[PDB]
Amino acid sequence: NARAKRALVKREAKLVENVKQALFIPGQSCNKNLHDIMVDLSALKKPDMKRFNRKNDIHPFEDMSPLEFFSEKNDCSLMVLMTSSKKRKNNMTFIRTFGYKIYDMIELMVADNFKLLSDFKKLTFTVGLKPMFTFQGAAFDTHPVYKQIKSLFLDFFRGESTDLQDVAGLQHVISMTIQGDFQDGEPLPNVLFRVYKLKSYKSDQGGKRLPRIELVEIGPRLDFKIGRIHTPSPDMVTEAHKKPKQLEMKTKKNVELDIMGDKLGRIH
Amino acid sequence: KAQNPMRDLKIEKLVLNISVGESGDRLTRASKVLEQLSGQTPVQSKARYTVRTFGIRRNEKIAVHVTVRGPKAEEILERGLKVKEYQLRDRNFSATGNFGFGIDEHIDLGIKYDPSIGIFGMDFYVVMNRPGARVTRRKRCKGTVGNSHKTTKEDTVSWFKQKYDADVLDK
Amino acid sequence: ILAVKKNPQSPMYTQLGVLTKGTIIEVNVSELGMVTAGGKVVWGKYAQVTNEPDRDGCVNAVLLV
Amino acid sequence: NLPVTVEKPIPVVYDLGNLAAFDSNVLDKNDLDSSNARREEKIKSLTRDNVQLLINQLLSLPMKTTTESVGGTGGQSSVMTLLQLPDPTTDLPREKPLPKAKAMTKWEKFAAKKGIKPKERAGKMIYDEASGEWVPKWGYKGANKKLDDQWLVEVDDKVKGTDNELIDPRTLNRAERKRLVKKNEKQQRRNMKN
Amino acid sequence: STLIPPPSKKQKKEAQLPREVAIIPKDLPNVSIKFQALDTGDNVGGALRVPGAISEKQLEELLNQLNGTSDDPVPYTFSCTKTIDITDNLYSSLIKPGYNSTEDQITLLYTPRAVFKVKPVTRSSSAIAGHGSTILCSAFAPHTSSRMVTGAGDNTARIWDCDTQTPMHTLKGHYNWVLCVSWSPDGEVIATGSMDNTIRLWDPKSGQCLGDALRGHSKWITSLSWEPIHLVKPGSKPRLASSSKDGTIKIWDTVSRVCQYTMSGHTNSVSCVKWGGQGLLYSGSHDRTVRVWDINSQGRCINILKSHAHWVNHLSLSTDYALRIGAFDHTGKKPSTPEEAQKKALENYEKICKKNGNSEEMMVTASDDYTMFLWNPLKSTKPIARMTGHQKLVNHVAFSPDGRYIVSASFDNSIKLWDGRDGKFISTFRGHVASVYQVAWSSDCRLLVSCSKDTTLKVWDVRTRKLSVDLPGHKDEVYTVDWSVDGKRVCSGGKDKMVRLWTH
Amino acid sequence: AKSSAYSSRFQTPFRRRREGKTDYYQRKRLVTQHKAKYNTPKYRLVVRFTNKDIICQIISSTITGDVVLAAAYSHELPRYGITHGLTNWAAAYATGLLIARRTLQKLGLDEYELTEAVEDGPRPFKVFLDIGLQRTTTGARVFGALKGASDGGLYVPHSENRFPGWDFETEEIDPELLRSYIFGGHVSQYMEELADDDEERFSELFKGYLADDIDADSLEDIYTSAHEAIRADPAFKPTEKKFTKEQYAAESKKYRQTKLSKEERAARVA
RNA sequence: GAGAACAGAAAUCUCCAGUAGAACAAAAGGGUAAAAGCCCCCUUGAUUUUGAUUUUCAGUGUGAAUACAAACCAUGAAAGU
RNA sequence: GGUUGCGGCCAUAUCUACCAGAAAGCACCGUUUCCCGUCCGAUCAACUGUAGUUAAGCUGGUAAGAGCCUGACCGAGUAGUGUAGUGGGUGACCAUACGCGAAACUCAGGUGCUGCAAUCU
């Protein structure tokens, strides 16, 4: 009973939220390639990952209730539904939920020119450390679709939030690059997702403080075509972007805190 | 296969059970006489249910038992077989190659009678297995036994014929 | 003296800060050189007032170690 | 000895709290299309330059050192030097809404109206004058249930003349206690409904 | 716990603002520099122009090439006169602060250093029991860091194997508290002076007692010193100088187990005795004087130094590290012959003794008048310098192994670092909240360890002049601390009846 | 008489749980739980005991299966001078000391990473003891190997209530008993006790010491010399391979059973 | 499912099979099996105390409730909880 | 290619019945003074690899076994499902253009892939 109360307390909302959990749901139609890509993404996400195994009849763009039920039952705010169809081959639907209700959904399709994680056969990073991010393309700052993609991927793979970082944990970088700048009225270029591991070397021109960096790709390399979109309502956007402000000290004019910790008032 | 020394059937454990039914002084005396018999303290079994006709409440003491292993178990077993005059039924063995029987009075075992002791009966049960039965018991890599290696009823009967030379009567 | 923790007569006297016999106060022990098992410097502890300052003009206390 | 000074036409932006670097330069479709065999080299070079800039920023960030030894709480030992990451700049939606401020209960409104201050709650131990011990005022082995264990209870004068005279006073007091507890629970449920 | 004030909103915005990258300019012009020796005041090469992007290692190689010792270089440290060291490169050291411009000259003071490094001790290896009373003294073996001697208040000494953190030998010959312990500089015998006015000698390998106790002192032993190996003729064993509360210093020949000389000039209790490297003995006593005796002249007092107004608690020599180490080094190598041992000990002692023209053996005396005096007894009889600033009595004083620094640990919960040649004040080490009892250098003169009354040890970095690491773990007062020759282990002992071992 | 519906509804555990050698409840806390959120990588000192060998490995977890950083076995102990008792408390201590010294020599800690750009000195190497499916009991060989590694110079966080000689009454240890177990005093005492009590039992037990003419009072000497040699030269020298990879492969596939084709199976059925 | 005097439909012991069909909470459309079930060991501190921080109160404005964090505390070989 | 230790995917890996495994390893097995735990050295703990065995553990082959898993240009762009041009029809409803979109069935198939380190007649 006390354990159940602790579980409910952990599940309930709080001022500083936990790391968002991701649930990987197979659909009615699944493939070995879909399973391998899901395994690679879950490996990049763990230990904030849960994976279903059976087949589920889910149609996100026709009904939201099973996804909302899964979110409420598993306490996972990120959903990755893997399905396949003749029109949409190797379809991954990313559903980000707010308050156990559908906040937004993106739908991408994985191109055939992809290599799995075990194809490269290279030494990879330690399990469960936050990566570095790189985003290439002005559409990440201008276009709403690529804005949604950037925010979704940052929220998905950000992991634990901290203000102190060990330099021995800066292992790998995730790059999301837009395949060429586009113009209005054109098809959306595919988004290229790559994973590299860092190797530092002596630079001889940056002293002993700034080493030369090199990247060795470890996979997976993926090409996402942007199939379908589903954007939140503006009131939901504002509710999801509200801040608690309970922790931070209130600002007051002409009142400062000095280095010794004494509260000081200014006189004009 | 039978020539290999690893297929021998030996005394795994001998369990002596005394189910007194009603908790109290008789249970204590049964534990005392089992201690003086086997040289070791017994272990009590808690009640599992409550029956008015059985006169047992919830979570009381019903039976004591002693598990003996080794040459001491062999000595107890040979004294019990001397009491039983070397004759067992075909039904006395089980389908798993383990056999037991009841002894109505422990005075015939050789224990000197005491008026405070009274009279107690006890159930002997003997477990048979070949070496290599710790695979099901060890903490790491717990695995099942081979189909041919498993102890069986007729194999235990053959072992009893070889060891104690006592006829196993059909009835 | 850092604070008044518990005046045994009443919580009203505790919040008024009355120093009587048996009052639990908080004292600065920086010059006593106390270190925790974890390496923290102790500079504040509890003491009990063991006299009547109204009678003898001074406060005497025993440190609660 | 390769250079570590990446020069970029359009100045990139950083979110060091999220450990992210964003460049909004010009990307050509020809060098990035699947028809090109050098797309991997181009993407690797671009990501390498961005990672070099991000690493420069991170290693120029301020650093925290400590003097505490290993085996103590905190996770940072004397040899470890930790980068001080700033607050994250990029805004992301929450997973759950903010906890709403609970409306005042009936007791809270009455206490505000009548000026009743909250109790100090120093502890649950009360002194017993009939003995020489401090006892809990409620709970496990609490002093609120000693009447049940009392060896002798005098019968009240007011109980006489009613049919409740034969009842054990300990039973009567336990029933009154349970009625009070259920009344408190009903008041809590009423406040939650309101 | 009292926390530091948190950052404000404006400070958070400043942090989120983009950072500046400390990069080396490619257009950095050349700078004119002149080398200068700290020890000798000699310049090499005159005005030479060097690139602005020169590294410390490249500058070191260039200086070795200028000196002509490129085949066998010796690493140097560079400073520029405020005097600021060269940390990584010249531009980030001097030009980036902007104090010295590119057109001006740079006068680089170069100082030799140690080839090896000692890692700071960061954790407790083990808490070893075995002593029934409080620990009073401890030392490490000079030849190896796997042997520690520890004398306590249960009338016993113990030899501990530091590799397994387990007791090895028990030495139970004395009758009263074992006040002081010492190891022979050749590593052959342990000498213990006790509260029962006796001295005993022990073979460490067998854990055994050599002969009977040394008797003759009418009061308890205060300090033990050994004759240096470089002065001991080959084929003979070093003699043992002992001081005591009765005010006399006795010299013992351990070969014949005799007493040769009994110096008695002090009117009061002798605090300490030190056997220097030039055939002299220095004694400090509660009669506020320091007596310099000549061993070669039938124990006749050469000089009497009178400048202190209280008890001189401690005294130290510039070559004390070499005197205690004999012929051994940090690599733990043992010379094959006694002649080779004497020659190598002479070379090691001369490395500190003869430098910048003439060999000198500086002495420093720390007294109960809150001060210290720095003397050069061979040349002059007046004190060379006076070190003042401590607000309470100076309990311990130690010369650095190279002799370039002095460290004074006082009862005002502070340590002070002074220059070793002229005695001027450099810095103050703070962080102890009770009185500091004693101190110990590392082998490369970069790290220091101190034990205090507040149940803590503290390791300080001498270069940055700050606290490196704080070591709690003792449940009561710590009385003794020592650092191994190879710089791998630190031992501490006190009132808790436990020997604490500390490693990296 | 199990049913097909039961077979369909059956839910097997992971493979390592089926052939039980991995505790995933312990593994998840060892790998995915951190005291602080500074993203400092963790390393495990996995210690395993067979019937005749001791395996000590320093392993770092990795998303594509974990990677061994260094390893040491008890069959390298005859190289340093331990030809008997390769599975005892003293052998475990020697193996822990060996793996610690080997790892320290490999890392260069005791005679271009991104940390060296920010910190002046290398960190002490910290590992967490992994015991798998073993019982934590006072006086165990796994804690002996932990003590060996700690004395070797790795930072393994541990208490001392599992070493031999720890008194259950007062929170204190007996370092004399601990040193006896370190240098095999229990084995030597059993040797003397057998030689005094039962020569028949001493004929079978400790037969190799009799064959090599190794005295009961020389165990401490040989353990000390082994420790000295391990500290002197801890580098790994692999065993010389008399044959080659293809030779071993061909010789093994000569005995391995050959697969039969589907057409051959259909012919056999028909 | 078989074996064991009283002892049978129900007492107690032994072996094999046994995806949980048991016992705990929620109302899973995938909760828990070297457990989240049963037993044993340690803790009775759980209403700690610090805060220039959040909200409320005060004629007693450096106090108390309250929220959050930190230092501790408990246990464990440890990771950690 | 065998084997060992740590793993990833968690049945192509599960259950039932046969057969083989030279060398090494693993396991069975031997002892109870010491550390440690039980009624029972059965489990756990310690010691020797000493007395033996591949009888079991474990791996591999076999079975029109059960179960499970994988591609389909296989059903099929089909059932079903939302708008629509004033399409008719006073009438229960019907083809059409744009969207979304199954499973049963049939064919072809299968019984582990693999990363790190060490070792092998």
The DSSP-derived string for E278-336 is: TSEEEEEETTS-EEEEEGGGTSEEEEEE---SS-EEEEEETTHHHHHHTT--TT----S
Interatomic CA distance for residues D49 and D43, integer angstroms: 10
Tokens found for residue A225: 């075509």
Half-sphere exposure of E23 (CA within 13 A, CB side): 14
Cβ contacts of B110 within 8 Å, gap of 6 or more: B79
What is the distance of C-alpha A64 from the center of its chain?
A: 21
Residues 36-95 of F with CB under 7 A from strand H: 44, 46, 48, 50-53, 55, 57, 59, 61, 64-68, 71, 73, 84-90
CB E468 within 8 A of CB E457: no
Positions in chain H where some atom is under 7 Å from a protein CB: 1-2, 4-11, 13-23, 25-31, 33-37, 39-40, 42-64, 66-68, 70-73, 76-77, 100-103, 109-110, 112-121
For residue F245, which nucleotide's C1' is closest to its Cα? Answer: H1
CB E351 within 8 A of CB E277: no
CB E108 within 8 A of CB E79: yes
CA dihedral over D6, E18, F118, D71, signed as positive or negative: negative
CB E276 within 8 A of CB E230: no
C-beta atoms of D69 and E12 within 8 A: no
Residue nearest to nucleotide H57 (CA to C1'): B135
Say whether the CB atom of F262 is under 7 angstroms from strand H: yes
C-beta atoms of E20 and D60 within 8 A: yes
C-beta atoms of A249 and E6 within 8 A: yes
E293 CA to H20 C1' in angstroms comes to 93
Strand partners, A135: A176, D22
Interatomic CA distance for residues E428 and B129, integer angstroms: 79
Task: Give the length of chain E.
Answer: 504
Question: Exposure of F132 by Cβ count < 10 A (0-12 exposed, 13-18 middle, 19+ buried)?
Answer: middle
F50 CA to H6 C1' in angstroms comes to 14
Find the helix or strand (DSSP H, E) in which A226 lies.
strand A222-230
Interface residue of F28, F29, F44, F63 to substitute, partner A, most A CBs within 10 Å: F63
Cβ contacts of E219 within 8 Å, gap of 6 or more: E197, E244, E245, E246, E269
What is the distance of C-alpha F106 from the center of its chain?
A: 19
Interatomic CA distance for residues E209 and E206, integer angstroms: 9
Closest C-alpha to F58, from F71, F41, F48: F71
Q: How many CB pairs under 8 A join B and F?
A: 11
**A49-51 and A22-26 strand pairing:** parallel
Interatomic CA distance for residues E488 and E502, integer angstroms: 9
Q: Compute the C-alpha angle F172/F173/F177, nearest 5°.
A: 155
Question: CA–CA distance from E31 to each of B4, E91, E99 (Å)?
Answer: 91, 10, 14
Closest C-alpha to A177, from D39, D4, D7, D54: D39
What is the distance of C-alpha A199 from the center of its chain?
A: 24
Tokens 């000074």 label which residue? D5
Residue nearest to nucleotide H112 (CA to C1'): F15
Tokens found for residue A72: 């409420």
Helices (H) and strands (E) in chain D, counts: 5, 6
Cβ contacts of A266 within 8 Å, gap of 6 or more: A254, A255, A256
Under DSSP, is residue A137 helix (H, G, I), strand (E, B) or coil?
Answer: coil
Under DSSP, is residue F150 helix (H, G, I), strand (E, B) or coil?
Answer: helix
CB D143 within 8 A of CB D130: no
CA dihedral over F82, F88, F93, F99, signed as positive or negative: positive
Under DSSP, is residue E111 helix (H, G, I), strand (E, B) or coil?
Answer: strand
Tokens found for residue E451: 């034990």
Q: What are D's interface residues with F at a Cβ cutoff of 8 A? A: 59, 63, 70-71, 74-77, 79-83
What φ, ψ does residue E460 adopt, rounded to 5°? -115, 145
CA dihedral over D85, D86, D87, D91, signed as positive or negative: negative
CA dihedral over F230, F236, F237, F243, signed as positive or negative: positive
Interatomic CA distance for residues C7 and C23, integer angstroms: 5
Closest C-alpha to C29, from C42, C10, C38: C42
Domains assigned to chain E: 123-503 (2.130.10.10)
- What's this structure's resolution in Å? 2.3
A85 CA to H92 C1' in angstroms comes to 38
Tokens found for residue B33: 């006489």
Interatomic CA distance for residues F88 and E387, integer angstroms: 60
What φ, ψ does residue F241 adopt, rounded to 5°? -100, 115
Interatomic CA distance for residues E378 and F38, integer angstroms: 59
Interatomic CA distance for residues E489 and E501, integer angstroms: 7
Find the helix or strand (DSSP H, E) in which F26 lies.
helix F24-32
Interatomic CA distance for residues E40 and E30, integer angstroms: 27
CB E469 within 8 A of CB E480: no
Interatomic CA distance for residues D165 and D33, integer angstroms: 97
Tokens 């790559």 label which residue? A194
CB A18 within 8 A of CB A73: no
CA distance between the termini of chain E = 28
For residue F30, which nucleotide's C1' is closest to its Cα? Answer: G79
Interatomic CA distance for residues B77 and E63, integer angstroms: 94
Interatomic CA distance for residues D144 and A141, integer angstroms: 67
Interatomic CA distance for residues E196 and E176, integer angstroms: 5
Say whether the CB atom of F29 is under 7 angstroms from strand H: no
Q: What is the DSSP string of F152-206?
A: HT-B----SSSSTTEETTTTEE-HHHHHHHHTTHHHHHHHHHHHHH-HHHHHHTT
Query: Between chain B and chain E, are at least 3 CB pairs below 8 A?
Result: no
User: In chain E, which residues have their Cβ closer than 8 Å to the Cβ of A207?
Assistant: 22, 24, 55, 88-89, 92
A74 secondary structure, DSSP code: H
Cβ contacts of E424 within 8 Å, gap of 6 or more: E385, E418
Residues F238/F239/F243/F247 CA torsion (nearest 10 deg): -60
| Strands of D82-84's sheet in order across | A164-165, D82-84, D63-64
Residues C35/C38/C40/C41 CA torsion (nearest 10 deg): 0
C-beta atoms of E5 and A257 within 8 A: yes
Q: Method used for this model?
A: cryo-EM
Closest D-chain CA to F158: D71
Tokens found for residue A54: 């059976």
CB B163 within 8 A of CB B157: no
Angle at which helix A32-45 crosses helix A144-157, to 10 degrees, equals 70
CB E489 within 8 A of CB E162: yes
How big is chain B by its Cα radius of gyration, in Å?
Answer: 18
Question: CA–CA distance from E350 to each of E278, E323, E327, E498 (Å)?
Answer: 11, 11, 12, 39
Tokens found for residue F222: 């040989």
CA dihedral over A122, A123, A127, A132, signed as positive or negative: negative
Strand partners, A68: none
Closest C-alpha to E287, from E263, E312, E307: E312
For residue F264, which nucleotide's C1' is closest to its Cα? Answer: H62
Peptide bond into A220 cis (omega under 30): yes
B138 CA to H26 C1' in angstroms comes to 15
Give alpha helix (H) positions in E37-87: 56-67
Name residues 68-127 of chain D within 8 A of A (Cβ). Answer: 76, 80-88, 90-99
CB E399 within 8 A of CB E318: yes
Angle at which helix F219-232 crosses helix F185-197, to 10 degrees, equals 160
What is the distance of C-alpha B69 from the center of its chain?
A: 10
Tokens found for residue A202: 């002596």
Q: What is the DSSP string of F211-257?
A: HHT--TTSHHHHHHHHHHHHHH-----PPP-SS-HHHHHHHHHHHSP
Breaks in chain B at C–N > 2.5 Å: after which residues? none
Strand partners, E157: E151, E171
C-beta atoms of E122 and D79 within 8 A: yes
Interatomic CA distance for residues D27 and D50, integer angstroms: 14
Peptide bond into E383 cis (omega under 30): no
CB D194 within 8 A of CB D168: no
Name residues 129-188 of chain D within 8 A of C (Cβ). Answer: none
Closest C-alpha to F96, from F45, F61, F164: F45
CB E242 within 8 A of CB E213: no
Interatomic CA distance for residues D87 and E12, integer angstroms: 7
Interatomic CA distance for residues E200 and E212, integer angstroms: 7
Under DSSP, is residue E211 helix (H, G, I), strand (E, B) or coil?
Answer: coil
Q: Is D63 on the interface with A (CB under 8 A)?
A: no
Q: What is the DSSP string of B41-105?
A: --EEEE----BTTTTB-SS-EEEEEEEE-SHHHHHHHHHHHHHTTS-EETTTB-TTSEEEEEES-
B135 secondary structure, DSSP code: T
Shortest distance, CA E295 to any CA of chain D (angstroms): 47
Tokens 């559903």 label which residue? A95
Maximum distance among all alpha carbons in chain A?
Answer: 74
Question: CA–CA distance from A72 to each of A159, A237, E325 (Å)?
Answer: 20, 20, 73
**A132-136 and A101-110 strand pairing:** unpaired
The one-letter code for the residue type at B129 is N
The one-letter code for the residue type at E230 is H
Cβ contacts of F42 within 8 Å, gap of 6 or more: A126, F30, F31, F34, F60, F61, F128
Say whether the CB atom of F253 is under 7 angstroms from strand H: yes
Question: CA–CA distance from E331 to each of E143, E390, E445, F233 (Å)?
Answer: 9, 38, 16, 15
What φ, ψ does residue C45 adopt, rounded to 5°? -145, -175
CB F39 within 8 A of CB A162: yes
Half-sphere exposure of D94 (CA within 13 A, CB side): 18
Interatomic CA distance for residues E285 and E243, integer angstroms: 10
Interatomic CA distance for residues E75 and B97, integer angstroms: 83
A43 CA to H100 C1' in angstroms comes to 33
CB A95 within 8 A of CB A105: yes
Interatomic CA distance for residues E236 and E253, integer angstroms: 10
